[PDB]
Design a protein around this ligand. Structure first.
Ligand code: 81K
Length: 138
């Protein structure tokens, strides 16, 4: 049921967010990214700025979910999801949701941080629509 699917997202999210303090230190990210992560799954919450996108790219990179062009590694993102409780079907759906979101998000400004932040917003909305958003912070 919806709560068990939210717990997979919850598990994925906490694991994804673990090295955030290291990404903050390494890239001199501002304290607002920690707030944005705390509120990541809050309905209606609007992200501060592109630095939250920089934080998402760093976390992805640390989990080696990015390829050389700072784009999602589909196979590695799938396996990440499965190691944190997703079945093959759910893992594939999540990768499809991110990919769709990347495709419907043009990077006109050559700004991966902004683009990643817009991909994240698109992804968060899709998860909310599936009622797969947990009520717990990162
Ligand atoms: C559970 C926490 C998930 C937070 C949102 C992560 C979304 C995208 C990661 C960034 C990768 C896609 C952005 C680059 C476009 C190409 O692929």
């Amino acid at each position: 049921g919806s709560m068990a699917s939210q717990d997979v997202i919850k598990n994925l999210s906490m694991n994804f967010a673990k090295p955030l303090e290291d990404c903050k230190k390494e890239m001199d990210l501002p304290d607002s990214v920690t707030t944005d992560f705390y509120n990541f799954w809050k309905e209606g919450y609007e992200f501060t700025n592109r630095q939250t996108g920089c934080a998402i790219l760093c976390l992805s990179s640390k989990l080696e979910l990015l390829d050389q062009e700072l784009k999602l590694h589909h196979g590695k993102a799938q396996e990440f999801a499965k190691k944190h409780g997703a079945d093959d079907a759910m893992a594939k759906q999540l990768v499809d949701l991110i990919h769709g979101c990347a495709q419907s998000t043009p990077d006109v400004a050559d700004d991966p941080c902004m683009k990643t932040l817009n991909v994240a917003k698109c992804f968060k909305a899709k998860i909310h629509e599936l009622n797969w958003a947990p009520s717990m912070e990162l």
